[PDB]
Subunit: 150 residues, 3 copies
């Protein structure tokens, strides 16, 4: 009887593994990107930093925070796809000139475009990623593509 | 020993599925879904007249948003606020004027009518819309409102 | 009997996961997807020329919509009707004019050509589009059509 039940359970699990794998592909198309254990997903629209940040946190995640070249490339795919620069999670709002993650830790990876960050006009504390994958500090009030990570 | 080994194996596979699925649930609901209790509201993102909206939800295996508690109503309101578009609820008093029911015919177990509503304005309001402030108003079924289904 | 209870526990978890997964699958398909058999069609919601559309589907781990039966075609038609935009199918006759094949080079096992099609108009129609009425027409691969992938 146990052997009978174990077999039924094995089949149920195998079915779920197959169904789940197909479902993951469906979910990620066309607004998501999986890289490592991280998943980037764009909302498809633009918002200023504070609004974008709240949407991500309320959804149980946070604004895109690429921590490696591999993550940045995955994120860049969505930006290129929507042809819209996106906001990253990092800012130097606390200490001008020092960009940090929402936790408060210092950047462990960066991909600044030449000359950036430059605090243009003395008011750029947020970061945007261009279609070429490079970063630029930009005013938090501007509207950029919303991309969260989970 | 084999059965034991088999069981332990299944344990690890199930743990992987649960963790992987837990992540995908969050990804899926962003930005058009809202989970509340065991119910999930999902907006189509566009507006349609009542009959069209209702068919979309039913064919999808669900039904139009039917908040049955203040918590469910507040969750649905979040989507309405996000899209900034009032949405249709599933309930109507099409059978018996003044008596609103769910698609199953059951009487309402919760309501959040704006003051003075429902008022059957113009003698022709049998459907219900929820505003960005979460309050309800009976409205003509021919009007176009945000489509939100529950699953 | 410790394995009996362990198996009992694991199954409850598995069945709860099955229920949650089923609910999330319905949510996922609303309103841009359609399930038919073991196949799932999902539209990106925008249009693109054939080559770009084909790349999007393959990079996503799938391929362009390839209806292989009347049932599959009807499901795909639902999405085309909903978006009110004709979509590209995966099949082409680029290798041998007049002979349409799936990306694998295999010959069609089902077709739903509109009357008079395929006609290779202008001597340059090697791709296929499906209309809101479900019928097919060969069309120039450079045209932009709704992107629908199958998984
Ligand atoms: O454009 C290629 C397409 O042309 C014809 O279809 C026309 C149709 O005749 C017009 O009435 C209108 O619907 O525009 C269509 C697209 O131009 C051919 O019938 C068709 O075979 C061909 O692919
Ligand atoms: O307008 C704001 C932007 O202008 C230019 O692109 C500058 O190179 C950049 O640093 C700045 O953020
Ligand atoms: O125009 C229709 C609506 O007009 C106003 O909002 C009334 O307060 C409301 O009761 C009615 O349904
Ligand atoms: Ca500053
Ligand atoms: Ca700054
Ligand atoms: Ca700058
Ligand atoms: Ca009436
Ligand atoms: Ca009425
Ligand atoms: Ca009213
Ligand atoms: Ca040809
Ligand atoms: Ca041809
Ligand atoms: Ca033709």
């Amino acid at each position: 009887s146990l052997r009978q039940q174990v077999e039924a359970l094995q089949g149920q699990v195998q079915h779920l593994q197959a169904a789940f794998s197909q479902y993951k592909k469906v979910e990620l198309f066309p607004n998501g990107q999986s890289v490592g254990e991280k998943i980037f997903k764009t909302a498809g629209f633009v918002k200023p930093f504070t609004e974008a940040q709240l949407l991500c946190t309320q959804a149980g995640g946070q604004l895109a925070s690429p921590r490696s070249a591999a993550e940045n490339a995955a994120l860049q795919q969505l930006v290129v796809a929507k042809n819209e620069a996106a906001f990253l999670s990092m800012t130097d709002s606390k200490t001008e000139g020092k960009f940090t993650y929402p936790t408060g830790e210092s950047l462990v990876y960066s991909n600044w475009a030449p000359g950036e960050p430059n605090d243009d006009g003395g008011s750029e504390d947020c970061v945007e990623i261009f279609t070429n994958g490079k970063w630029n500090d930009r005013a938090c009030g501007e509207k950029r593509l919303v991309v969260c990570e989970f």
